[PDB]
Amino acid sequence: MEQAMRERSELARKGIARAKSVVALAYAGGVLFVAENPSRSLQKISELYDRVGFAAAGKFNEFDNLRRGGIQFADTRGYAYDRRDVTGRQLANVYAQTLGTIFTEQAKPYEVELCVAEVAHYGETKRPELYRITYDGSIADEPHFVVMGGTTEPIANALKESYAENASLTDALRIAVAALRAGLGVASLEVAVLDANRPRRAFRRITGSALQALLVD
Amino acid sequence: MEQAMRERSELARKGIARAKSVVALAYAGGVLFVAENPSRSLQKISELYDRVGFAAAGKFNEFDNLRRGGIQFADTRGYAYDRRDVTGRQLANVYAQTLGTIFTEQAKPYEVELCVAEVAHYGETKRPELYRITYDGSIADEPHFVVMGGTTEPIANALKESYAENASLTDALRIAVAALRAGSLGVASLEVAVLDANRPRRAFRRITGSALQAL
Amino acid sequence: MEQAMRERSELARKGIARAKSVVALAYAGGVLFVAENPSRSLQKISELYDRVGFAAAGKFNEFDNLRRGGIQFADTRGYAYDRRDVTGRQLANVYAQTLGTIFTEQAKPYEVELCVAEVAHYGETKRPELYRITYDGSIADEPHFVVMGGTTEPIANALKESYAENASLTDALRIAVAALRAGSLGVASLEVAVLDANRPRRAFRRITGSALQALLV
Amino acid sequence: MEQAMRERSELARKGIARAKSVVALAYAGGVLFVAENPSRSLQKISELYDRVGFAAAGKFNEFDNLRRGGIQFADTRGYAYDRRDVTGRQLANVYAQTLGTIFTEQAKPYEVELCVAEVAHYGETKRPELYRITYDGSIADEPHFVVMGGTTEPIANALKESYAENASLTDALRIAVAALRALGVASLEVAVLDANRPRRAFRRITGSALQALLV
Amino acid sequence: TTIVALKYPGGVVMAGDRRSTQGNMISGRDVRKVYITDDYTATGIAGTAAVAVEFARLYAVELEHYEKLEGVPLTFAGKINRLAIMVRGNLAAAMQGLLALPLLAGYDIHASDPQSAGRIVSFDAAGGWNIEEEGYQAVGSGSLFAKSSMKKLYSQVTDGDSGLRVAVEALYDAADDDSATGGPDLVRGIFPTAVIIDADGAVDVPESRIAELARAIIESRSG
Amino acid sequence: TTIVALKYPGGVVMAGDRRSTQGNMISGRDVRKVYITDDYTATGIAGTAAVAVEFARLYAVELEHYEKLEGVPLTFAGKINRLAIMVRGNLAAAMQGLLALPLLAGYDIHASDPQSAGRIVSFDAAGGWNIEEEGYQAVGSGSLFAKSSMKKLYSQVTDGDSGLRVAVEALYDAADDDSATGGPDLVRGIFPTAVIIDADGAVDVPESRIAELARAIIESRS
Amino acid sequence: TTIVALKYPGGVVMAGDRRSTQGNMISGRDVRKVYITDDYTATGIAGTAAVAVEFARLYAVELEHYEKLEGVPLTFAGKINRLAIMVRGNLAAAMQGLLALPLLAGYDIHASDPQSAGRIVSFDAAGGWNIEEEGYQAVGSGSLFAKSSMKKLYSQVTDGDSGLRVAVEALYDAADDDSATGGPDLVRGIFPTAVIIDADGAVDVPESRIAELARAIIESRSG
Amino acid sequence: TTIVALKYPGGVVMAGDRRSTQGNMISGRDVRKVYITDDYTATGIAGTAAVAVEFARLYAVELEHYEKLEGVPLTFAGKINRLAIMVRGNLAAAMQGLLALPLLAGYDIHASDPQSAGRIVSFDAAGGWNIEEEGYQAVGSGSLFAKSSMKKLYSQVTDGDSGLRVAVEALYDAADDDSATGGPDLVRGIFPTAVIIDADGAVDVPESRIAELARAIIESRS
């Protein structure tokens, strides 16, 4: 019993330590996802629902399995009831239950760390919501930022001192690359936002020339 | 066999001891739930049925599963029979059965401790009922209060001293937060709710923000 | 295999010995169930059928499962045939089989000890019947009393030199409370029920509150 | 747990190291698959879809089961939607998922390494795509070449030193056999994803033509 | 068949005739159609005999089963729902000729006002249920006649005796205008059955009392 | 077919005819329709022969099965309930033309008054059962003739012998008015079968006695 | 049956008649066809009584189930969808004669301004649903008469009270032209039931106010 | 119902009426039958309302679903295929009277010629699908009238605005000859709904523009 469970906890823990880092923080325009990612085609930051976005660190196939499952949940519940009934709190809760089941019952625990984030619906005043769900089903909401993967103390520290509420888009990005360096160009990053000012689908990737401008321009 | 049950028992006991504390106690207006909770949206206290409420300590996802199962049970029984046939005793019983089966058969026992409370129906004279269910399905009947999670003994002693029957809401809340303090401090770190026997139908109601601060 | 069964037997024995005690004895008016129980609403004695009663010692959820299963069996048999075809011997037998299976097959044996009792149908003259079923399915036919749970030597002895056939209700209750208090009492900490052979149909009748106090003095 | 998983990992790694080597290179006309294979009729390189090719190293029956499951996936997806909705990135995704499940749950992990490659549709302009999926479901995007099976480091370095973008068919084939030697028609299996074909890009280069390009 | 039920101050009465038919042929003269289903409820069924007997037996067993499993008896509303579900489950069979419709009388020990604690609930083939508020109800091929009789006689019900009398008389009119409802058989001494329920429970009314009531009604109509 | 049963002081008697038809054609002259299903009960069935036989057989096996499993026999109520459940089980087949209705006669060793321990239960196609209070009963295509015969003859019943005679005469009137019921065959020596049940159990009435009663009835009507 | 619902500035009102029939036979005089299905919504059903009551009960249970499970109530659109799915699910029984059509009236606590937060949604046997933007709707055997009545009376709706008056008069016209909808019963003191919903939630209208309005309508039609 | 869709230089337009019926009885006056099913496609359904709404909502969910699972949207061919699969799946219910037919208007971002990137696809109850090459199309109880009207009016389409006008006029002729298609309601101020799709995406045509066009048609025909 105990040795099996802490064996799983160790395997997962170390696996997530080995992998690249992911930052998410709330800014005046919504939520910002910035992850260290060289791939041109494999993505760690994703849209879940209209105003809900998803980020993960760890083993790709496993947090992509979880990502797909989240999209299944969100679209299913959106259809069975209404779109507005799908909430980031719901998705974080279902991720908690699911990773608890995986961790205690799957052949090998998932080496993943998830963040579910929700921004306000168009025209409404609602502070963003950020949820962290770890490999064992533990779940915590945090008000400002979330870090995952790799060595989290240096990045969480850099932000702990450098984070300012309602930062600009370029200020947020700059402090995100800054904090992540403590753990970098366009070819090494994956960047996206939940933009609270988009009418319907808040998720928007920042890539290529546009991202280049956003970094220094 | 016996060593496996000792290992499961210990994993559960340590799990529960490592978590924030929850208190539930009967007062003049019904039942009061007071739990340490630094979150803004994830809840340890809940409504189960018209007059029946729920509080839990331990690993969130596990007592949230159990919470959802209890609400499923309650709504199903109320539908198949009549609302007033749904009783706190029933739900505590079914939690005893469920946690027994989990503890002995689940891949990992549930690191949770549960409390089921019931107040009288509107206009009836009935002493509140407080049941506690532990990780191995053991069930206890308590007439005054229930303490769960973390280091429960100091809190239980502080309550054994400061508690009195039919206290006011304010007295009960302050006594409860005192007991919680003697075991480890304001609105942003507290979840508070009541089973309010003076409500006409749904007794469960939360006390948050401005209303909570003023107590 | 042998050592495993020995471990299950030990677990069951220690569990039952940690629990509070229950006595059931025949008296001039039927059968008497007295069990040490502080709770207001959690019950160790129960009706099974018209003239058949039940009492258990050990872990609550387990002997409650068994109690429910017994009510299921009795009601099904009575419906499939006739009410008078349900006997206490039948339910004792099915409890013996059920606890044999439980003891050898489940993840953990049940830490329970059962008593099934039967009184005569109204107007008929038949000595009460007492059966004991132990955690492993063994079944004893006892003629005067059954003791279960905790340390049964003190209580079984006090009853062995204080029990007489056809005592009164109050006499049998005094005998019972004394024998129980030996191997370890009032209304606030006692559960008392009777199989009253003088009742027309349902013979199970609890003794609670003012009535119990009135029978204790 | 970590011991069982690292014994699985070890069995896979050793099993792959004992097998012949394969190389996939992006060149001016598309993608080039060159593998050491002595057999007359046992293929390690295969077509998957219109513009998507497959190459594998390790135990035959296992990467043939994977080849078949991939063909199944591609044809099913193309029929349920449209042919052009099938892409190399998603065949690689599903290969990663499948090899993860196999690695953690099957009796024995598969001793395989996969490369999925995609060239541009006819007349379109898109740099080829190369994906590597290892025995544990790990997936890697590569812009120039992938090396699979056996002792890879000599081949990888040989390529890092001899690889030129937009190389021709003959030149790229040449540096491919070169890296492999760090080998003639009777012991080589070569095919190309030919971006210049109207629909089905996969074309094998056997016998007369094969040695024809080996001068 | 005719089953009648009605409220009186502090209680409720239910009664039913004794007839059994197979088309026009009389196949039964002493059938029991009103059943004490629990200490505070009686059920009376019309329709196919086999289905009615099974309904009463099954229903009583269900109520007691719950009482023993959960330590407390169902709320009256729960009893109603249970019977409704049992009837609804029999709908296909009922459409194919096995129709049975119950009538429910009870005394609700959890009612607010003890004087109006009586309860009468009617049912239809689909599981519909309706708590009657106008004080009386009937079911069966003679139900309309008994309901009009009782419509004229109900103001005479002021205690248990008058209620029981009105019930028996309604059954008398039922048999008077419905050949499928048996009347009092004075040659064989077979009279309707009746159950009465108050705060002390539900009890069978002795046949001799029904007999006196019947002789009184007869003498009253003859002169 | 006609099956009769009636109570006499301290016991019950059941008797049945011997005919089997396929439409108008006579397919059987010595069929036995009254079976001793246990030491204190006999069952007589009317209807499709195959279903009647299966009923009697399976029913007796069920009663004995219970008795051996539980060390004690079913109460008479239980026996009724099992028979009725068996009849209900056959209702679909019965609606497709395989109809069979039983008639149950027994002595209840658990009855209060041993003089009224006789029991006669009838059944319908849906599994309805009714315990008979008025002393006699019948089943089958001649059951109305026989029941109306026993309405007039029943007062003559003071003991088992008179009960047997009344039963045989009932069957005789039945075959008199119903072509699907067989009367005494004096040419072949085939007569109705009969079982008597009292506190000593259920036993087959010997053919000689029924033959005598039959002949008496015959010559009495000339 | 006739159920009506209409929007008034600040909320919505629903009203239902009390009659129950079996062919031409009046089987019920006190039925309650309008249920408070949650704090801000009422549901009124026409059709087979058992199916309608089942619908109200199960729909209320479903809403509250979601609410307790997720900590927050469904959006009004979600409520619509669940009800529609229920109807669509009963379509087959509906074609076998067990037909029930609901009418939904609610208050959307998430609407922009609270004076127009009222919602009236109608349904058909196939599960189709329609948010009525013309202020009023009715369902049942008397819904045509009630709708053509409100078409003329709706300009008089200026608050909750006038809304209730127009609802009761629509029901009165329905009972005037449809024998399956029951009018006010002044002898027995039985009147339609009504719910009113505003920002403070859903509330049952007290019988006495309905009776007042009814008598005013009657004494107006008569002179 | 009538739904129309026509191609203009660089885009497509779709429009539908607002009428709901239960036989002869008008049960709806403001039904929205044209839905923006994704950033580059709109679907308009005729038939049973419950089915039509189900189709629009579910189909939209399915397209966006694929997009989020796969990081890229379906090819237009894939969208056609999914809609046809849905329609075929409803074929039995349609046989039982739950019939609903879609019309699809799209702009293919992957087409070569940006001027001829407009797409119009009609469907039948079996799930058959057909890409219209001749410029316009319609579906519903008035589709024949609208199509014959567009046959004569199509040569006037030279930009988005003239195409919108032609669409509204086709709906006007449909309403003119078909009582199940609703015309402009000047009393209530309710007009057909319209969606317009070009390279910048699909957007709702504001009601005011359709009101103006309808009034121009009305005045013209007076």
Ligand SMILES: Cc1cc(C(=O)N[C@@H](CC(=O)N2CCC[C@@H]2c2ccccc2)C(=O)N[C@@H](C)C(=O)NCc2ccc(F)cc2F)no1
């Ligand atoms: C199918 C099918 C239906 C029938 C059928 O109509 N069967 C008759 C009943 C009948 O002939 N027999 C003869 C033997 C046992 C059975 C009986 C059971 C119980 C009591 C008295 C007799 C019936 O169902 N008749 C109906 C019309 C009837 O009279 N019903 C009155 C009634 C109401 C409630 C109740 F509990 C019992 C009743 F008999 N037969 O096959």
Ligand SMILES: Cc1cc(C(=O)N[C@@H](CC(=O)N2CCC[C@@H]2c2ccccc2)C(=O)N[C@@H](C)C(=O)NCc2ccc(F)cc2F)no1
């Ligand atoms: C379908 C179908 C119906 C029949 C059918 O009507 N089959 C006849 C019976 C018949 O022709 N044969 C010939 C060979 C065996 C069988 C038989 C069985 C037992 C005894 C004597 C003969 C019947 O069932 N007739 C009915 C009307 C009948 O006579 N029933 C009397 C009866 C009652 C109880 C009993 F136990 C046996 C009986 F024969 N056959 O297939």
Ligand SMILES: Cc1cc(C(=O)N[C@@H](CC(=O)N2CCC[C@@H]2c2ccccc2)C(=O)N[C@@H](C)C(=O)NCc2ccc(F)cc2F)no1
């Ligand atoms: C099949 C089938 C149909 C019927 C049938 O006609 N069943 C009738 C109802 C009926 O006679 N009874 C008598 C006792 C219980 C039941 C009742 C239930 C509730 C309330 C009052 C009575 C019906 O459904 N009639 C329809 C035409 C009707 O009147 N419907 C009005 C109505 C609407 C909504 C609602 F909630 C309750 C209602 F009664 N029975 O079997």
Ligand SMILES: Cc1cc(C(=O)N[C@@H](CC(=O)N2CCC[C@@H]2c2ccccc2)C(=O)N[C@@H](C)C(=O)NCc2ccc(F)cc2F)no1
């Ligand atoms: C079975 C069955 C069929 C019908 C039926 O004919 N149901 C009608 C619709 C109807 O009366 N009601 C009233 C309450 C909700 C529902 C509605 C839904 C949506 C909009 C307005 C109303 C229909 O389907 N009529 C058809 C002939 C129709 O008008 N179809 C036009 C239409 C097309 C596409 C679309 F999305 C919506 C539409 F209304 N009812 O049960």
